[PDB]
Every structure is written in structure tokens, then in C-alpha cells.
Design a protein around this ligand. Structure first.
Ligand SMILES: [Ca+2]
Length: 447
């Protein structure tokens, strides 16, 4: 009289999880754009745009969004459902790998979801070695009586790393369209290690993610492919470089609040690049990433990474959530941070030279800032920038510079410079949670 009796129930539960992740309130929108419009390289096009209140840090405890919280905990609950049951199922010898991968998917997803909750609602690990409040670690199934208190950021990372590490030992390395695989999980785990300052472990995981994905036939998009590769429909025979893709379909659409519709002047004209980022990017006019900018006349430049597949509306563009390019940048960062310049130059040069083969960082003693300056060009509109500055104890500095190629783009915010002491880099705990859970403590500066 329960929901998991046979393996296919696990597959059904995973399908539900991926369908939840596809929402524009989850990984087809809000969970992606958060780290861009709270940074320095993208902004809301106006205060009344969907991204406006995030860009302006305009939320209060009384009006803050609840979707990040609800969607991620929904996902975690179904992962728990799988994880509490999957090992009890008796299966055939020849279903073992398949079952191991299903369990690995659930573990990777739980780690991802708890990582997102922790970075959204808790101060960065390296501020105080995870001493601040993260969120509740929920590993079983909720009932009406469940009223957990927030664990620490450190405790959360313990769980995040444990789930992801274990997933890397269970997940298949095969191409798996719209699903998490070994190389995607290793790449995320490398990111999680960087945020924690575990650079040796970050480096090992990024390097192995690359070696494994490339043996499997994934490859960085060439300079020639880059401008249009985003609209390809990858397959096992042509994987491209996306290691985990959110698949959106004409017949299964996330709607007009998706990245595809927000990042387009044919959509909601919602979020664009800042002038300072345009000026940084165009310092090298042969940088191939200039070719994924879509200009609304001479007013705004949108990041045209959410390219619909053939026949589709921009609404149903897939989300390139984890890319091989990030494993390269993670390895570069971890190399710098462990004092291996040779290795940093090796990995960084692959990104640099794909953007423009006439450039090289050979002969440079690479700095963290050098690596992050490449990373911001590569990962613009994919949800990284604010976190990457803030996690490193750096100050986000919005620059009010003008450019005549994008002459309507200008900052419009009270908040131009901020670091990990700014209380609004964290969303407040949603009111519905505060109202329903008396063991829930609000983030500082809000109450
Ligand atoms: Ca699509």
C-alpha cells in the first residue's frame, strides 16, 4: 500500500522530478537567472520586469518569493522517496547497473537541490567556514508534523558532497538526454568543492569529469560551432558539450517566464547584459561570444543562448544547465588555487583559444581574477556570476558606464556595490514557511 514496488516506479518518480525541474519557477527560469541579475554583468531591463525585484534587491520578508523554496524541497522529497526504497527492491543481476544509475540520479539531484537552497538562503561557506545558517536537511518524507530548524551551511555541504560523491560512483557515463549522468554530477561536485575551498578535491573532480566526458565523445563546441550550437539537439552520436540539459518541448512547455522568453527582444525583454559587461566582452572584437548577443536596435543586448530547437518557439528553448566548459573553468580555478600554473594555463587556454584562436594565456602567471574574468564571459546568463564573486570574498561592483551600441541600458538600483556582508544577497525565508514552522529562523536584516 505504498508508491514504490518495482523499478519502473523509481523511473516514474524520476520523471516527475525532471518535470518539476523543467518549470520556469525551477531550472527553466528562476533558479537560473538568480545568479546573473543579482551580479554585475546582467540586469533587469526595467524595474517592472520579472527580474526587476531580484536585480534591485527589492524583496522583504512579507513579499519574498516562495517558489525556490517549495520547488527545491518538492524535488528533495521525491529524491528521498526513491532513496528510501530503491535498495529494498529485489531486481535481476542484469538490472543492477540500471538500478545503480537511477539511484545515482536521485542522489545527484538531491545534492544539486540542497546546494541551490544553501547558496540562495545561506551566506557563502568561506565567509565563516559554513558557520551561518543554511536550510533544513530533509532526508525522509514530510508529514503535517514536520517542523525542522535550519541546519548550518557546513552541515548542508556535508550532505551535498556526500550525495554528489556517491552519485559519481553510481551514475552511468553514457549520454542521457535530459537526465543527469556521471560527468554532469562530477562537474557540479567540482563546483561545490570550489565554493567550500576544497581545491584539491575540486581539481580532481573537474579533471576526471573532462577525461570521462571526452572519452564518451563530448567535446567543447568549436569556435565555428559556438554561435549556433545552443540550438542543436544533441544525441549520443553528437553530444556537444552539454552534460546536463533541461529539455523543454512545444508539447511540454515551461511557458513565457522561461529563459528562452526572458532573454529575447521577441519575448519579455526582461533581462539584458550591463554596459560594463558588453565593454569587457568587446575588448576583443574577435571573441566568438560576441556572436551570441542579440541586439534590440542600438538599445539593449540580450544573451541569445536559449535558442529554440527546430520548429520550436523561443519559449521552449532547452536549458544548458551544466556544460563541459564549466569543468574546464573549474579545473583552471582549482589549479590556480593549488599553485599549479602549468595546469591552470592548460585548462584556461582551451576556453580562451576556443573564443579566439589568436589569443593565449601561455607564459602568464594566472590569478583567480584572471580565471573569473574568463568564467564570466563564458557563463553569462547561465546563473553563476553573483555567486562567483561573493563566494570568493570579493565585492560585486555594478559600474554605471554608458555605451552607444546599447543606449537604453543603464543601471537603476540603490545597490551598486556589495559583498557577503550584504543581507540581501540571501532571499528571505518565505512567509509561508515562517508562518507554518515555528522552528524556522529568518535571515538577518529582514526581521
Ligand atoms: Ca526545446
Amino acid at each position: 500500500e505504498t508508491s514504490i514496488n518495482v523499478l519502473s516506479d523509481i523511473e516514474f518518480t524520476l520523471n516527475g522530478i525532471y518535470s518539476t525541474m523543467q518549470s520556469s519557477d525551477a531550472y527553466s527560469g528562476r533558479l537560473v537567472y538568480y545568479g546573473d541579475v543579482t551580479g554585475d554583468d546582467m540586469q533587469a531591463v526595467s524595474s517592472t520586469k520579472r527580474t526587476g525585484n531580484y536585480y534591485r534587491f527589492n524583496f522583504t520578508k512579507d513579499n519574498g518569493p516562495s517558489s525556490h523554496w517549495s520547488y527545491l524541497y518538492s524535488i528533495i522529497q521525491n529524491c528521498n522517496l526513491i532513496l528510501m526504497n530503491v535498495d529494498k527492491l529485489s531486481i535481476d543481476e542484469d538490472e543492477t547497473e540500471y538500478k545503480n544509475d537511477l539511484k545515482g540520479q536521485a542522489l545527484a539531484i538531491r545534492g544539486m537541490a540542497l546546494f541551490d537552497l544553501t547558496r540562495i538562503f545561506g551566506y557563502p561557506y568561506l565567509k565563516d567556514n559554513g558557520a551561518s545558517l543554511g536550510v533544513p536537511i530533509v532526508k525522509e518524507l514530510s508529514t503535517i508534523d514536520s517542523k525542522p530548524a535550519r541546519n548550518t551551511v557546513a552541515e548542508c555541504y556535508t550532505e551535498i558532497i556526500s550525495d554528489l560523491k556517491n552519485s559519481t560512483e553510481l551514475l552511468s557515463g553514457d549520454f542521457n538526454k535530459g537526465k543527469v549522468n556521471r560527468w554532469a554530477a562530477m562537474t557540479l561536485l567540482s563546483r561545490v568543492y570550489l565554493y567550500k575551498g576544497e581545491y584539491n578535491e575540486a581539481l580532481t573532480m573537474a579533471e576526471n569529469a573532462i577525461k570521462g566526458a571526452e572519452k564518451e565523445g563530448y567535446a567543447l563546441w568549436t569556435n565555428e560551432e559556438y554561435p549556433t550550437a545552443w540550438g542543436n539537439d544533441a544525441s549520443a552520436s553528437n553530444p556537444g558539450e552539454i552534460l546536463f540539459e533541461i529539455v523543454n518541448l512545444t508539447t511540454d512547455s515551461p511557458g513565457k517566464e522561461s529563459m528562452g522568453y526572458l532573454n529575447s527582444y521577441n519575448g519579455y525583454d526582461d533581462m539584458c547584459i550591463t554596459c560594463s559587461f558588453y565593454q569587457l566582452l568587446k575588448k576583443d572584437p574577435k571573441d566568438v561570444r560576441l556572436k551570441i548577443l542579440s541586439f534590440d536596435k542600438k538599445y539593449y543586448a540580450y544573451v541569445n543562448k536559449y535558442q529554440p530547437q527546430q520548429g520550436e518557439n523561443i519559449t521552449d528553448a532547452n536549458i544548458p544547465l551544466i556544460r563541459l566548459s564549466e569543468a574546464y573553468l573549474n579545473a583552471a580555478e582549482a589549479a590556480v588555487q593549488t599553485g599549479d600554473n602549468a595546469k591552470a594555463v592548460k585548462y584556461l587556454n582551451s576556453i580562451v583559444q576556443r573564443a579566439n584562436p589568436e589569443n593565449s594565456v601561455e607564459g602568464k602567471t594566472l590569478t583567480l581574477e584572471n580565471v573569473l574574468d574568463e568564467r564570466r564571459k563564458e557563463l553569462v546568463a547561465e546563473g553563476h556570476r553573483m555567486y562567483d564573486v561573493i563566494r570568493n570574498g570579493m565585492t560585486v561592483k555594478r559600474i554605471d558606464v554608458k555605451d552607444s551600441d546599447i543606449n537604453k541600458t543603464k543601471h537603476n538600483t540603490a545597490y551598486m556595490e556589495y559583498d557577503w556582508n550584504f543581507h540581501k544577497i540571501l532571499l528571505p525565508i518565505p512567509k509561508k514557511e515562517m508562518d507554518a514552522n515555528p522552528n524556522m529562523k529568518q535571515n538577518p536584516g529582514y526581521v
